[PDB]
Amino acid sequence: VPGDPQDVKATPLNSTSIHVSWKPPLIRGYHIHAQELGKGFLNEPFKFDVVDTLEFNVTGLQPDTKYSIQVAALTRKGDGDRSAAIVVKTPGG
Ligand SMILES: [Zn+2]
Ligand SMILES: [Zn+2]
């Protein structure tokens, strides 16, 4: 099974979306996982399926909101290792 995607970058495009790009693990499908950020409670994260591309615009997000972005390759047992999280805030505030 593959390791984590390499050289991940993420930057907001507008108040509702983020352009995520990466290089393959050291694979035709990936997941992008986006989690909105005193007891460690979290709302439901977003997941995006990506096929046959090494970048993707994740959309439908909340304005003025911090998101943790991770990418994973898809494998026979589920996701491979996730890239180290990138925290980015959408504009709109
Ligand atoms: Zn996944
Ligand atoms: Zn999937």
Author numbering: 708 to 733, 741 to 751, 755 to 810
From the paper:
An understudied class of proteins in phosphotyrosine signaling, the receptor protein tyrosine phosphatases (RPTPs), are a family of single-pass transmembrane proteins whose architecture include an extracellular domain resembling those of cell adhesion molecules (CAMs) and intracellular single or tandem tyrosine phosphatase domains.
Proteins including the FN4-FN6, FN4-FN5, and FN5 were soluble, but only the FN5 yielded diffraction quality crystals. Interestingly, a ~5 molar equivalent of Zn2+ was required to grow diffraction-quality crystals of Dlar FN5. Overall, the Dlar FN5 adopts a prototypical β-sandwich fold described for FN domains with two Zn2+ ions. The first Zn2+ is bound by His-745 in strand C and Asp-766 at a crystal contact and may be an artifact of crystallization. The second is coordinated by residues within a single FN5 domain, including the Asp-796 from the KGD motif and two histidine residues, His-745 and His-747. Although the KGD of Dlar lies in the same general area, the side chains are not as accessible for binding with the Asp-796 positioned against the β-strand and the Lys-794 pointing back toward the molecule instead of accessible in the solvent. Importantly, the KGD does not extend away from the domain as seen in FN10.
